[PDB]
Amino acid sequence: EKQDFVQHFSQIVRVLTEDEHPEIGDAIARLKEVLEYNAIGGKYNRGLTVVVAFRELVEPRKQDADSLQRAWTVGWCVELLQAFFLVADDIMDSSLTRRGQICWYQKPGVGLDAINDANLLEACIYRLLKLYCREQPYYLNLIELFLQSSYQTEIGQTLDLLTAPQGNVDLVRFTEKRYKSIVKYKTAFYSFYLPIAAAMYMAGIDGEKEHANAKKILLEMGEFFQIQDDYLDLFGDPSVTGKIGTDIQDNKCSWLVVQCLQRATPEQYQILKENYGQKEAEKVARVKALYEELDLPAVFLQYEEDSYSHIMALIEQYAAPLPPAVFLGLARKIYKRRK
């Protein structure tokens, strides 16, 4: 599956490049370079979800070459939405590596020009949708869906950054209630809801109950995925995950610190206060010792088992009339992941 999906990328590149106006040639070469560094190297769960789900929702005799091509292309549109966000995210989080190579903005010669690079990747979504789905009854649905997903994710990031000021203590806002909102908005909508929802619209499924039902399962699945992400920031292998963690030094409202705070003694509270949110490596080292000392890896492994069971109960409840396989495929893909 992955190999077929991933191999469509050069057609994606070729169409967006074929826009040679030989005056903008140099900016089009620059965009090619940006697509290849930034869109390649991840898992492709989002883009493959668009494709798998489409096949599962459309009768095979209606899966002609042109409509499967549209499915691949909308999958790559979710991959570009992702790239757009990660490139910007890496800048704002002072990150070092992404997908096992240095973050694009750290490339000598690139710098904060990557800000325009990220906006350019976002624009490619709508060019792709124009070029392949313009004459489709779902065209506007997809456009409004991508735009709403972008907005939601920018709201969430806004709350991610607010709650994590450089230079200021902020343990008072690290609550479960707060964590849930941030992750709903910054991750769950675009990573889980958007890809399945894209495929539904392409299969002709636009009912509000049907979309709201898919949303019940998929938002929960997004919360879970971000929680895993927060655990891997501190406790994952950067050669495996492809990325160096920064949450503690960026003062972030990570699942870990939330859980630390509800378990911590007043003296433990103080350790976190003196040590969290700062670049000093020995202060980070202390926070991690507090985490390991409170058995948060075990706390997480139990949360991961329970959350998973609740997700499977939501599928039993809300999957119909869609095949459970649609959601089971994704769930089983992200469960117990170390990457």
Binding site members for isopentenyl diphosphate: 43, 46, 82, 99
Smallest distance from Mg ion to CB 228, Å: 9
Quick check: is 89 catalytic?
yes
Quick check: is 93 catalytic?
yes
DSSP code of residue 244? -
Would you tell me how many other CB atoms lie within 10 Å of the CB of residue 135? 6
Q: Residue 170 in contact with residue 236, Cβ under 8 Å?
A: no
DSSP code of residue 175? -
Smallest distance from ligand IPE to CB 47, Å: 9
Q: Which of 37, 54, 85, 291 binds ligand ZOL (CB under 6 A)?
A: 85
Kind of pairing between the strands at 97-98 and 101-102: antiparallel
In whole angstroms, give the CA distance from residue 326 to residue 292. 37
Please identify which of the residues 90, 93, 117, 233 carries the catalytic annotation.
93
Cis before residue 321, ω within 30 degrees of 0?
yes
Q: Does 79 bind ligand ZOL (CB under 6 A)?
A: no
Query: Identity (one letter) of the amino acid at 21?
Result: H
Long-range CB pairs of 21-28, under 8 A, 24+ apart, other chains included: none
105: tokens are 């903005």
The entry of ligand ZOL, ligand IPE, its own copies, none that residue 240 binds, CB within 5 to 8 Å by partner kind? none
Nearer to ligand IPE, 164 or 203 (CB): 164
Quick check: is 84 catalytic?
yes
Residue that the structure tokens 């869109």 belong to = 39
Query: Identity (one letter) of the amino acid at 219?
Result: L
- Choose the binding region for its own copies from 20-28, 235-243, 258-266, 317-325 (rule: CB under 8 A): 20-28
Q: Residue 248 in contact with residue 284, Cβ under 8 Å?
A: yes
The contact mask relative to ligand ZOL for 151-170 (x = CB under 6 A, - = no) is: ---------x----------
* Angle made by CA atoms 253, 254, 259, in degrees to the nearest 5: 100
Q: Residue 144 in contact with residue 170, Cβ under 8 Å?
A: no
Q: Does 319 bind its own copies (CB under 8 A)?
A: no
User: At how many degrees (to 10) do helices 9-17 and 114-133 cross?
Assistant: 100
Q: Which of 187, 228, 259, 275 binds ligand ZOL (CB under 6 A)?
A: 187
Quick check: is 186 catalytic?
yes
Q: Residue 193 in contact with residue 49, Cβ under 8 Å?
A: no
Numbered residues of the known binding site for dimethylallyl diphosphate = 98, 186-187, 226, 243, 252
Nearer to ligand IPE, 32 or 99 (CB): 99
Nearer to its own copies, 169 or 289 (CB): 169
Q: Does 93 bind Mg ion (CB under 5 A)?
A: yes
Side-chain half-sphere exposure of 190, counting CA atoms within 13 A: 27
Residues that bind its own copies (CB under 8 A): 23-24, 26-28, 30-31, 88, 91-92, 109, 111-113, 115-120, 122-123, 126-127, 130, 140, 143-144, 147, 150-151, 154-159, 161-163, 165-166, 177, 181, 184-185
Residues that bind Mg ion (CB under 5 A): 89, 93, 229, 233
Residues that bind ligand ZOL (CB under 6 A): 85, 89, 93, 160, 186-187, 229, 233
Residues labelled as active-site residues: 43, 84, 89, 93, 98, 160, 186, 225, 229-230
